Amino acid sequence: TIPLLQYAPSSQNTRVAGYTVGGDEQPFVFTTDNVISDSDFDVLINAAYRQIFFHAFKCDRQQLLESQLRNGQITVRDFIRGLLLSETFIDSFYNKNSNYRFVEQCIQRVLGRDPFSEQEKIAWSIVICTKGLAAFVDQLLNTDEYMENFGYDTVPYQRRRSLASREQGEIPFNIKSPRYDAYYRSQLGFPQVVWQNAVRRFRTPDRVPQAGDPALFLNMARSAQ
Amino acid sequence: MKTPLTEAVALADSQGRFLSNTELQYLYGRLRQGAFALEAAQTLTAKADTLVNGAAQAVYSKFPYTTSTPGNNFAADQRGKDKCARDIGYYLRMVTYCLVAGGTGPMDEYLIAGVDEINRTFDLSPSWYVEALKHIKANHGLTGDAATETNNYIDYAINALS
Amino acid sequence: MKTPLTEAVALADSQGRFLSNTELQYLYGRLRQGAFALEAAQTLTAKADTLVNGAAQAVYSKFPYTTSTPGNNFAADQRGKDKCARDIGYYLRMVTYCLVAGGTGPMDEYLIAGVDEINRTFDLSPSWYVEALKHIKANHGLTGDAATETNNYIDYAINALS
Amino acid sequence: MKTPLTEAVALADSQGRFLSNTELQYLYGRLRQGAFALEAAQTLTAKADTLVNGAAQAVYSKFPYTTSTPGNNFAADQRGKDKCARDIGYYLRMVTYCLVAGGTGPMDEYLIAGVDEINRTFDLSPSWYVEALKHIKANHGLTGDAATETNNYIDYAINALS
Amino acid sequence: MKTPLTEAVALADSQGRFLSNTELQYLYGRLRQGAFALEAAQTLTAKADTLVNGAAQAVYSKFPYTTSTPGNNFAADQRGKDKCARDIGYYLRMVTYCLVAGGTGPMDEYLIAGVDEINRTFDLSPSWYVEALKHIKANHGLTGDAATETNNYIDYAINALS
Amino acid sequence: MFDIFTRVVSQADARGEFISSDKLEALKKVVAEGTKRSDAVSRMTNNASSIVTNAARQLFADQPQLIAPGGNAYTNRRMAACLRDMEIILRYVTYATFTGDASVLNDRCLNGLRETYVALGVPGASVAAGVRAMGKAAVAIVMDPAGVTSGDCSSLQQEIELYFETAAKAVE
Amino acid sequence: MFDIFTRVVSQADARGEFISSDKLEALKKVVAEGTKRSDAVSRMTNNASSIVTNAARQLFADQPQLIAPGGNAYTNRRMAACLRDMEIILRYVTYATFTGDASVLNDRCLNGLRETYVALGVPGASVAAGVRAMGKAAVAIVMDPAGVTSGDCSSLQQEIELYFETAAKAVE
Amino acid sequence: MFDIFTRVVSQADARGEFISSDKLEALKKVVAEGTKRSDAVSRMTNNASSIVTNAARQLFADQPQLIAPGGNAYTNRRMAACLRDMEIILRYVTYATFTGDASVLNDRCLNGLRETYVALGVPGASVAAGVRAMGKAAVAIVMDPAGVTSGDCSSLQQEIELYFETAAKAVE
Amino acid sequence: MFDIFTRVVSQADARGEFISSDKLEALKKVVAEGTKRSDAVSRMTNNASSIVTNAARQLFADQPQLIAPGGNAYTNRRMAACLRDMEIILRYVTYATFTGDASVLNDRCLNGLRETYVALGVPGASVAAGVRAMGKAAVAIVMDPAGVTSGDCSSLQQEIELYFETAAKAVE
Ligand SMILES: CCC1=C(C)/C(=C/C2=NC(=C\c3[nH]c(/C=C4\NC(=O)[C@H](C)[C@H]4CC)c(C)c3CCC(=O)O)/C(CCC(=O)O)=C2C)NC1=O
Ligand SMILES: CCC1=C(C)/C(=C/C2=NC(=C\c3[nH]c(/C=C4\NC(=O)[C@H](C)[C@H]4CC)c(C)c3CCC(=O)O)/C(CCC(=O)O)=C2C)NC1=O
Ligand SMILES: CCC1=C(C)/C(=C/C2=NC(=C\c3[nH]c(/C=C4\NC(=O)[C@H](C)[C@H]4CC)c(C)c3CCC(=O)O)/C(CCC(=O)O)=C2C)NC1=O
Ligand SMILES: CCC1=C(C)/C(=C/C2=NC(=C\c3[nH]c(/C=C4\NC(=O)[C@H](C)[C@H]4CC)c(C)c3CCC(=O)O)/C(CCC(=O)O)=C2C)NC1=O
Ligand SMILES: CCC1=C(C)/C(=C/C2=NC(=C\c3[nH]c(/C=C4\NC(=O)[C@H](C)[C@H]4CC)c(C)c3CCC(=O)O)/C(CCC(=O)O)=C2C)NC1=O
Ligand SMILES: CCC1=C(C)/C(=C/C2=NC(=C\c3[nH]c(/C=C4\NC(=O)[C@H](C)[C@H]4CC)c(C)c3CCC(=O)O)/C(CCC(=O)O)=C2C)NC1=O
Ligand SMILES: CCC1=C(C)/C(=C/C2=NC(=C\c3[nH]c(/C=C4\NC(=O)[C@H](C)[C@H]4CC)c(C)c3CCC(=O)O)/C(CCC(=O)O)=C2C)NC1=O
Ligand SMILES: CCC1=C(C)/C(=C/C2=NC(=C\c3[nH]c(/C=C4\NC(=O)[C@H](C)[C@H]4CC)c(C)c3CCC(=O)O)/C(CCC(=O)O)=C2C)NC1=O
Ligand SMILES: CCC1=C(C)/C(=C/C2=NC(=C\c3[nH]c(/C=C4\NC(=O)[C@H](C)[C@H]4CC)c(C)c3CCC(=O)O)/C(CCC(=O)O)=C2C)NC1=O
Ligand SMILES: CCC1=C(C)/C(=C/C2=NC(=C\c3[nH]c(/C=C4\NC(=O)[C@H](C)[C@H]4CC)c(C)c3CCC(=O)O)/C(CCC(=O)O)=C2C)NC1=O
Ligand SMILES: CCC1=C(C)/C(=C/C2=NC(=C\c3[nH]c(/C=C4\NC(=O)[C@H](C)[C@H]4CC)c(C)c3CCC(=O)O)/C(CCC(=O)O)=C2C)NC1=O
């Protein structure tokens, strides 16, 4: 069928080479092949959850993918695919956002980079409505950038967020993009005002005692004999 | 958001296919459900106030250490029992919403997704709400088909809590 | 593989949950469907042979250049018309399977997924099978509820072809 | 598997670089820890049996409805109290393992990862083990630096349970 | 950015947990390091000017073709030798920063990440800075614990260059 | 993504008490007219292709630029993509009258569509004329009765005109 | 992944002619007994949690090694994972009696499960005893007639015993 | 991501000469007070859960809307997410006083948090009151002495008040 | 991935009682010799590059095929990859003597390495000779004492010979 629009790429910290070195701003990398103990599976599963769902609660966790991955038949790439097509991601991210903001969020969380331009999210928003969320996630995983940067056996991360000798590099994309936007919090109607200022009690205004007032000596008379 | 209609739309939507005959059946099968379901929601709305009061009675009679031992979580004083009336009223209202929508999605969205951390951090033993929902499912006195729907309904509530 | 039951199982598997109240309605709504659907499948099995012969008659009468012009795709000689009887018999049999299963999944799996390349490479104009399915949906003569559902079912066939 | 040495190895493996000068300090800082830690593990091994018996005493005195109300989870009969001795002995032994390893990884691997579902499905209120660990951290009587390390230690246990 | 404290924070952030006994162990092990490290940074600051002059002397005596052959990279004239004083002063200052921070992260961030392309494109043979760092590690004269850090320290510099 | 049943649910939850009796008469008559509603949707759905080609055929008869060279829908994949967009708008308005609420329509397809058509260079008023003509054919396809039980299908004709109108005004 | 309706479909397609009349009597009585079938499934999943804890509590009363140290289900996450596995096997046998076919059961969960339990070191006979006791309780939740119209259900108790038996024999 | 040691390093590098003696007296007394600093952090994270529930329980006693229906923290996952956010802010302020610098706090969590809470519809002043009460309890937990040698932690009481204040003012 | 502390932990857990006193004398003397252990690791990784080039330079002096055309390490990226492999084996044996256990070595790098070198066509005995010569130089960086306190490192020179030997025998 109809191919994608050709959108020109824009400059970013990713398409550039970069001379990376081992520091902490580099995300700890979680790979299926070397975790081989039972606890390190828990750390990897927690990290993939932190990326895809932002701290999934026990309701959001899928027993089948975690079980099957601890046995080792599942690849972590297939595990991320199963997370994206799972209903808690669809419910939290595909439902509440429009197609364009969903593609923005999904590119950030699968590929680990911001989309290059608005026309890229526009060009990728054809395929999700025409061919389904499964085909969108499948075509996203099959692209060569996800494969060269992470591969089969690596949980993705935000790639080259922070440059050397910077205080800040970049917003971590978990802070930057939450699941609501302004448009759907308007539907939920959340800014109901806290209204705890200027209540205007009607009781009579207190007047400071004038010089020579009897009360002025009340507080010392209470302390005296 | 689990109603049969939105899941039909999500299936057609995920697939990308147009609405079909398979989706259509759900709508007139939602007739087998809804023709009693709206009646049962109304009669639960009538039964509601005595249901929460009896459920509070059953929870206090099952666990006397709640009404005895002083604590923030326990209903020793008045305000704890007010929190209990609030919590069981929330549970009964989510049962009514779950009954009107046709699926567990309102109940699964408004109650179930955070109940594990709330029961962990705030020291609310879920067997209390087990007692409350079991007393409700014994006391509601639904008739025929509507009653059967609630059991599947209220058992899902207990299974999410347990 | 689209039947309402397997889609309920697929939804519960993707959501990783036990079948809820909504799923249960699904099958007794498959009663609203199936109580006529199996009757209509039997009466289509009886109607079948005159249906394919009349559909071949209608396709040959609509497009005389098929029976006139010599070609591999066109039914000039006997063996082309034998291929036509095979193709329309396949279409009618997939309609019967689609009617018995309850959803479009047998028809969508056995016919629809490759029909675009076959019509492109083998020079089979889909308006021929449009004529054939329109003649079938006019000639089948189903009674009451069964006929409208079949009509809707056959419109999905034409919409996949067009 | 959280010990400082395996985390240094994991950091060096994830970065793909051999241990630096900073990595070396880690182990001679494990000297500030271990020079009291092995002593404290031995004295906990000596204190162990009276610790579990006093913790069972404190849990039964805090919650009399456990020893009163008949149930599978509650310690009404002998075998329930035997399960309690098993559970608190497991908790104390994981504290000793956590103390010897130097990090929370044995305790986090052997106890913490499944405690939420076990407390949910088997009706074990975690405030019981809160009482047990608070009684242990009051009763162990550790001296100097060893006592403080355990306290950060036992508070992590309560924070995982609460 | 490799100091032991920021790596402890990075480990706790990647695992999503709070600190443990290990963080305390890490920093009071940074006492085993820092109680000599700040002394050694001060005495290197005092030794600094004669260190760069002797290192320039050793590099010129090891490789006479630098002071002989005319070129932009070679220190034939004055300004080349000024560039050499700048380069070895940068190396010694990064050693001092690496000593004060406690880990290789300042040195690995300010020197190591681009040294391969700079030595490739600008024709700076790294064996020159090998000579310079070997002369520094022979000439600095730090007794006891300080010497081990430097060898561990300055050997990492040579291993990054070689 | 909102059914009208869960519209009543979410409004009563933001209120915070039980569903009142007046809303229950309304929901009961919704249940008595949802029969009309659901298969009104599918009636709209079956000729959906012929509706799409007739509306596009009329649109390119009315505006000869869009098949003229230099126009927006001139080359072959752009013309096919325009047919894809008109099919998508019809399918989502079909979903919206199946849910009984315009929330799926305004939620799933319309919202960023205005900015998409402006940023692409696509005319919006041409789409507005297309969805309006498509809606006229849509009710009439769903309104006229041929081989169908006589019924109160007029209620849908109202709401489906509202849904097509919201689609055309939100495209702009 | 096969409904018994599409079992008849796929068998008649591999044959290649229409569905015969004898299969249509059988499918009609399937339709007349599927009422029993579907909500037999849901009353089985009514007490699914208490069924799971009762079967596991019986299993660890019968085999005291599995809660003894050194046993397979001894530590806390391994015990929780065993409860997860028993819940999964009950849920899939529930899916299988909802489809009316054991194809979902043998297709979705049982097949690699034998090799998984052998490669993990997990005992298989303990699982077999657990699923057998779980099946006994499962029908009896189903076979009991309290609070419901009473009609013959000798078919469901039959087929669910078959499904639990296939589960236990395929675990081995 | 900056330790105060590498704060001195990066400032002396942007200067471009060696670290002066006055900064070395300051760093030596940093080394003599970092003992207080590091395990001040851990006694703050000792009662971090009870601190979080006490601050949230006070906040929902002060503002009854947030547990009233229609409020921001009303439903169960939104309330759990609010507890998650308060735990995260406490944990990052704990990291910041462990590094000894507010750079981790302003760098890791605070910066986009202002825009996130505005775009979500979340009130910011409620968070500000929560972090202020949480900071009061935080120093006092660390400040109070139970089984610890008496010492001058005034700087710690000082600097952690600064860190909580920067957190609350950057939330706004 | 196993520290010797958690080796004692996991063995005592599979036993299922507390850690005995004899293992505690052993672990205390482990703590008294781990000083030697950890920075034995770092002085091994002090000259790791020169160790790698000296072992490779000796290997290609001993086997002139590997720099002859047609050999395995002949072209430039294959020679660079061989240097990468020797650096990786040295780094992992360095990790293994830092953990104090060969579990990281046999767990992280050695296991599939045998099959990788056979399936690539890479000679294994050449790697075995390389790791053996590399181990000799490795202890002697450690083994010879210059400008430092004398010590009983015989036990430890010991363990790194064991680790290099396991590496060379597992390459084969
Ligand atoms: C809509 C779904 C929903 C659920 C499930 C829910 C649970 C819930 N129950 C709470 C409190 C409570 N719930 C209870 C009720 C009980 N505790 C007991 O010990 C009794 C046995 C039981 C009475 C049945 C009590 C006593 C509190 C008070 C906690 C406190 O004051 O700190 C709180 C803390 C909020 C507050 O401070 O008012 C939440 C979030 N809230 C919700 O909005
Ligand atoms: C189960 C679903 C199914 C479909 C849809 C199907 C279509 C189909 N029709 C075919 C041929 C054909 N189909 C036709 C039929 C027609 N062509 C005309 O021009 C007439 C108007 C029309 C008669 C209605 C003819 C004439 C061929 C012969 C092509 C040839 O001999 O090269 C072929 C080539 C296979 C062969 O060589 O026998 C396929 C795959 N096959 C299937 O198995
Ligand atoms: C190594 C870490 C570890 C933990 C944490 C653990 C918890 C644990 N406690 C259990 C039972 C138990 N634990 C208790 C203990 C108590 N319940 C109460 O009501 C008392 C207040 C409290 C006594 C302090 C009891 C009574 C049971 C019995 C449940 C039963 O018999 O069904 C069981 C069920 C296993 C069995 O049937 O023997 C597990 C898995 N097991 C572990 O292996
Ligand atoms: C990671 C495991 C670990 C911990 C927990 C630890 C704590 C720790 N705190 C210490 C001192 C101290 N800790 C405090 C803390 C305080 N005093 C107050 O009155 C304040 C309220 C409070 C700070 C808010 C003080 C005042 C000292 C005095 C000695 C010193 O300056 O270190 C010391 C000095 C050495 C010793 O006590 O034997 C230790 C060991 N050391 C460790 O290795
Ligand atoms: C902070 C870490 C840091 C490093 C490592 C560094 C290396 C560095 N050395 C340079 C130049 C240089 N470095 C040298 C030094 C030498 N060349 C020789 O042949 C001598 C043997 C050796 C004296 C030891 C010379 C001669 C140049 C001049 C290149 C030119 O003028 O084109 C330049 C080019 C910049 C310029 O034009 O001034 C860089 C970037 N710069 C840095 O900022
Ligand atoms: C789910 C809701 C949804 C909508 C509505 C949507 C629209 C949409 N329409 C597009 C293009 C288009 N839209 C049109 C539109 C028309 N042609 C005309 O002349 C008329 C003015 C108008 C017909 C009404 C044309 C010609 C293109 C192709 C422009 C191009 O691709 O270069 C594109 C660019 C991708 C492509 O198809 O090449 C998107 C994403 N995408 C979505 O996901
Ligand atoms: C999916 C298979 C299926 C179909 C086809 C179906 C149609 C269907 N249309 C119905 C009603 C109806 N259908 C119509 C439709 C119309 N009347 C007009 O005059 C208009 C021109 C036209 C709409 C454009 C009307 C007016 C009714 C009246 C009853 C009602 O409101 O449902 C009913 C009510 C129950 C009954 O008739 O027994 C059925 C069954 N039900 C099914 O299960
Ligand atoms: C969809 C079908 C499906 C099944 C059935 C399945 C089973 C399965 N069971 C597992 C573990 C387990 N299975 C058991 C089983 C038991 N405990 C006992 O003592 C008894 C012998 C038996 C209870 C019947 C135990 C203890 C573990 C944990 C072993 C471990 O994780 O170390 C694991 C390893 C992952 C983990 O849970 O840690 C898988 C993948 N996975 C699947 O995807
Ligand atoms: C999802 C919500 C829902 C439920 C729960 C439901 C159950 C249900 N069970 C029914 C029948 C029945 N159900 C049973 C079940 C049994 N009789 C026995 O003696 C056995 C022990 C047991 C099976 C193990 C029987 C025998 C009938 C007779 C009518 C029929 O065949 O459907 C019917 C027929 C219609 C009616 O009763 O009004 C309903 C409604 N329908 C629903 O819509
Ligand atoms: C690392 C730093 C970091 C922070 C701080 C952060 C905040 C953050 N808070 C959120 C929600 C939230 N935040 C709150 C906040 C509160 N409830 C109230 O009523 C008070 C006004 C306030 C408590 C202080 C609530 C209720 C939500 C849930 C809103 C929703 O999810 O719909 C969300 C949306 C995702 C979700 O949890 O559902 C993010 C990303 N994320 C980060 O990565
Ligand atoms: C990470 C930075 C760092 C290093 C490098 C370090 C090394 C180090 N090695 C030491 C001791 C020692 N190191 C050795 C090592 C050896 N003696 C031999 O004859 C053998 C050939 C060789 C082992 C192969 C010995 C024998 C001692 C004696 C004291 C002791 O047992 O620690 C000590 C004891 C305290 C001191 O010397 O002041 C230090 C500091 N400490 C540190 O903080």
Numbering used by the authors:
A (entry chain A4): 2 to 226
B (entry chain B4), C (entry chain H4), D (entry chain J4), E (entry chain F4): 1 to 162
F (entry chain C4), G (entry chain I4), H (entry chain G4), I (entry chain K4): 1 to 172
Sentences from the paper on this structure:
Phycobilisomes (PBS) are the major light-harvesting machineries for photosynthesis in cyanobacteria and red algae and they have a hierarchical structure of a core and peripheral rods, with both consisting of phycobiliproteins and linker proteins. The basic unit of the PBS is a heterodimer of an α subunit and a β subunit (often called αβ monomer). Three αβ monomers form a ring-shaped trimer, and a hexamer is formed by a face-to-face stacking of two trimers. In general, PBS found in nature is composed of two parts, a central core and peripheral rods that are attached to the core.
For Synechococcus 7002 PBS, we modeled 36 APC αβ monomers in the core, 72 PC αβ monomers in the rods, 6 rod linker proteins (LR), 6 rod-core linker proteins (LRC), and 6 core linker proteins (ApcC, formerly LC) in the map. The dimensions of the PBS from Synechococcus 7002 are ~450 Å in length, ~ 300 Å in height, and ~220 Å in thickness. There are six peripheral rods (rods R1/R1’, R2/R2’, and R3/R3’) and each rod contains two hexamers in our model. The central core contains three cylinders arranged as an equilateral triangle: cylinders A and A’ at the bottom and cylinder B on the top. All three cylinders are each composed of two hexamers (four trimers) joined together in a back-to-back fashion. For Synechococcus 7002 PBS, there is only one type of LRC protein and each PBS has six copies to attach the six rods to the core. These LRC proteins have three different structural conformations in their CTEs to adopt three local core structures for rod attachment. LCM in the PBS of Synechococcus 7002 contains three REP domains, similar to the LCM protein in red algae. We defined a total of 288 PCB in Synechococcus 7002 PBS with 72 PCB in the core and 216 PCB in the rods. In Synechococcus 7002 PBS, energy from R2 and R3 could be transferred to ApcD on A4 and A'4 through trimers of B1 and B1’ in cylinder B, respectively.
